[PDB]
Symmetry: C3
């Protein structure tokens, strides 16, 4: 027995998001559906396992959960649980809309309860410190709301989806200023540096959720978001040697949410005949990088250095 | 004699804004007009009294005014004066558009002169400190511009209204990042905590002003704003026991601007047949809470603990 | 011989931008074309000279360039080089679209390489300090992307232009919060104060680029941007005596980018019959102020206090 590190939920998260990206190509290229289904089954199976492991953690390692929850930094990774639950719901919708809808509402109520309890509590002061200003804060604050937005739109609740979308989008622009100033001043320690990959996520997760709610219309807002997303991509590419200066590690799955959302949004840009060449590049690049993450993970697994 | 605490202008402000919310229901439910007129007369009467008291303060307690004006924290409450003046103008428009227009321009020129003189002066450095980063800064920086926007639109100056709207909206997104980071790090002292209610205001005041200028069209922007507004509501509800930990007090009128603007925007969402159930909840909730503020205020009055 | 101070590129930048503003009036008032052509030739000639001087600096004063490049404050002025290159390209387009397109791509690739190398590197921490939070950061982070956006739109690449536009716009809203908080707390030393003029630029450069890409449609976004732009103008006017408290100097060309972009955007508001009176005021004001900058510069030149 061992307590599951909560950040491992980033693995089914990235795979699930990538399943959904391929799903959106089925009308252009039918074989995409099989790729999507395989990714989606693997993501769902991994999610089931990790949920069961986390249930074990809650039952037998509760003080570990309590400590992560109260931490002004580590609490954020708990948001991966409802986020992945919703994405698995979105996958399962293709086979069973009833079960999908249950997972989606569980994830939505869960994430909103979580942020309402913990994100707001930080405003009491004295616990969160300047050094707590980490990219992981995007998970409960931003990513969870975007995921609710897109999932609720899937279920047909577009106007409710826009409320969650707005919560996420404005929360993003309200947090990022202080994050980037912090990064400029304070060197993020190597042990946290893989989480720089989460910096890729906001614009791409945002535009993917937006396009899910607005019927795939590639409009001025969507183009604006893509532009900032690619700026951040270029910055993170330049920074990649620094990010991995102490070595390649499993934390690099942090990048997968943004990469998968880049792939998803690319399918919509392509459908809309906007920047098709860029879209092809983005889709291929993101799949190659996630493919590398999978290969590195299988490698770590086949040597027993996966989870503590 | 006593010098009027400037923050008391929040009382006619909240009542006036609530009058305007009910005014906007008259076409759906005719009895709303009487509720609106009663609220509007009470707000106007209280505003007259407080204006006269503040004129007395300027004449006989000028050094108190000077000190509040030069304070990098207390100056903000002075913006309540032109804000309330404009809202009373908006009320009076139903009876006398000429007098309304005079009040609206006085409030608009006044607030813009005030911010231009004092908000900009802060950029000289050395007076404002990190600890000065308070929710009250929204009043001169954000709320005053939104109120000009909506008031000018009432008078038919829609394009000028959009300029004030943009000034307010961008000023809001430019300030809030540093406010929330400050709240996270530094525990706001109990004596200032009721001003947390001002954190509710921006998104709702914003969308109410937007809907006033754009002919009540409930569009993507409006939905986005409502979503972030409700996020903040949920956060502030969770925080409410901490906000009042040292007891219930008259400062809780800080919440009334956001609550009244929630009510106002709800009437437009309802008219537009967008999220009608949420709109009903929002309208009823905000009225109940302001009703509680009024009851608590009458209580304080009937015991002589109103103004110093 | 002497090493050219890099900030002098602000002179052809302001003149070039002003040429483009007058160009956009030719369809309303034909004589505007001659004014535009004169400004454009002067800007281009000054740019050629300064480029040659900077090439000399790279060849014979390379360690000076290295030091400015690695500085977390001084690096930003290097972005003036590709920005001016693109604006000169935009001017030359009226005479030779081939040469214009070459300059535009050189400036675009150059600025994007520059930011990708240097703006991202700051996120490694430990070099940039709180005191490095200066208005000049807008140049590589914001202004360069807006200039690419408008230049690429000129060439017919509207969707690519929107990507650069979005990168600039979101980068602006992400930086400004921390800049204004810094200005509030820390008094910017007189030697840097003329750079306060760069604070005028973002909203106006933004709306000018937006109107260049969206076919001159003066819409809600454009009006919103103008409103915040004028707020900042009013603030900077009030601050002007403090800005120049140690005397008038050549650094005041910092204001010219925002002033010229105010003039440019005014032509589009006027064409669109939106706020025509404000547009006339803005156009005349900005030209008078740049005219004053030119007169003060000729004065300094005719006395040998231009460049070190
Ligand atoms: C899409 C986001 C995936 C995030 C995966 C990266 C984190 C996986 O591991 C996480 O790393 C941390 C830093 O050492 C710890 O603080 C966390 O509790 C942890 O589980
Ligand atoms: C995934 C869900 C994580 C839930 C962990 C909930 C932790 C709440 O734990 C809290 O710690 C408090 C001390 O501050 C005490 O009230 C109690 O120990 C408990 O309420
Ligand atoms: C992701 C699934 C939803 C998360 C449920 C977390 C429940 C948290 O538990 C709550 O924690 C509070 C502190 O913030 C404690 O003080 C409360 O007493 C407790 O009810
Ligand atoms: C960071 C926020 C950027 C917001 C951009 C909103 C741009 C809206 O601009 C509008 O976009 C709509 C769809 O493209 C249409 O009205 C028009 O094409 C355009 O007027
Ligand atoms: C990111 C979205 C990826 C979409 C993959 C598209 C790859 C197809 O490639 C394209 O096929 C077209 C017709 O089908 C050909 O006309 C084009 O020349 C070719 O580039
Ligand atoms: C809508 C905003 C209404 C604000 C009302 C709350 C403030 C009323 O009182 C205010 O409280 C302060 C804090 O103790 C003082 O600093 C102020 O000058 C004061 O008048
Ligand atoms: C509601 C209006 C409030 C107006 C108060 C104006 C206060 C200006 O007071 C200023 O204090 C300065 C010291 O800094 C001195 O110039 C003078 O005392 C005065 O100009
Ligand atoms: C709400 C009504 C409008 C407010 C008018 C306030 C007038 C402020 O008064 C001004 O204060 C300046 C400092 O910022 C002083 O230095 C000036 O000398 C003085 O004219
Ligand atoms: C924080 C800023 C959010 C800006 C959101 C702008 C969204 C505009 O998006 C557009 O909205 C318009 C009205 O809904 C219409 O063009 C379309 O429905 C949509 O394209
Ligand atoms: C926030 C705005 C509040 C609007 C109050 C509406 C309350 C009316 O209630 C509604 O009446 C409808 C017809 O009039 C009925 O058909 C609906 O079932 C009922 O909910
Ligand atoms: C539109 C922007 C024009 C900027 C021109 C102003 C700067 C010109 O000079 C600049 O001033 C600085 C401050 O002393 C130095 O740090 C720079 O390297 C310098 O060249
Ligand atoms: C306008 C273009 C400015 C280019 C200046 C490039 C400066 C790169 O200079 C770098 O300094 C490093 C020390 O940190 C060493 O690698 C080398 O000296 C060099 O690579
Ligand atoms: C404006 C014209 C484009 C600018 C080109 C600048 C080239 C910078 O030069 C680069 O600087 C890096 C540091 O950030 C060095 O470490 C690299 O080795 C070097 O290639
Ligand atoms: C800081 C960001 C402000 C974004 C404002 C977006 C406002 C879009 O609002 C929309 O604007 C479009 C053009 O005016 C049209 O759809 C409509 O007129 C309006 O619905
Ligand atoms: C900022 C853009 C400046 C545009 C300059 C316009 C100046 C023209 O001035 C205008 O001429 C009109 C007809 O041509 C007359 O009908 C108007 O009364 C007059 O104001």
């Amino acid at each position: 027995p061992f307590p599951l590190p909560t950040g491992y939920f980033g693995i089914p998260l990235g795979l699930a998001a990538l399943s959904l990206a391929w799903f959106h190509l089925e009308n252009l290229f039918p074989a995409a559906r099989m790729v999507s289904d395989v990714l989606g089954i693997v993501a769902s199976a991994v999610w089931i396992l990790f949920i069961l492991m986390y249930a074990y953690k809650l039952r037998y390692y509760f003080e570990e959960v309590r400590a992560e929850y109260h931490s002004p930094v580590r609490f954020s990774f708990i948001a991966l649980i409802p986020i992945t639950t919703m994405l698995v719901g979105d996958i399962l919708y293709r086979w069973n809309p009833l079960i999908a809808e249950v997972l989606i509402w569980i994830g939505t109520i869960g994430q909103l309860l979580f942020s309402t309890l913990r994100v707001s509590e930080l405003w009491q002061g004295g616990v969160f410190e300047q050094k707590s200003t980490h990219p992981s804060f995007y998970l409960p604050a931003v990513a969870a709301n975007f995921t609710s937005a897109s999932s609720l739109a899937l279920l047909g609740y577009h106007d409710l989806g826009y409320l969650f979308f707005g919560a996420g989008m404005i929360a993003w622009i309200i947090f990022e200023p202080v994050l980037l100033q912090h990064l400029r001043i304070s060197s993020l320690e190597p042990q946290f540096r893989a989480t720089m990959g989460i910096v890729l996520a906001p614009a791409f997760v945002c535009v993917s959720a937006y396009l899910s709610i607005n019927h795939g219309e590639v409009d001025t807002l969507a183009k604006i978001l893509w532009g900032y997303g690619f700026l951040q991509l270029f910055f993170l590419l330049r920074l990649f040697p620094w990010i991995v200066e102490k070595g390649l590690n499993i934390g690099l799955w942090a990048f997968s949410f943004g990469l998968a959302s880049m792939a998803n949004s690319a399918t919509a840009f392509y459908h809309g005949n906007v920047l098709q060449g860029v879209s092809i590049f983005a889709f291929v690049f993101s799949n190659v990088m996630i493919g590398l993450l999978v290969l590195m993970t299988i490698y770590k697994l086949t040597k027993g250095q996966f989870f503590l």
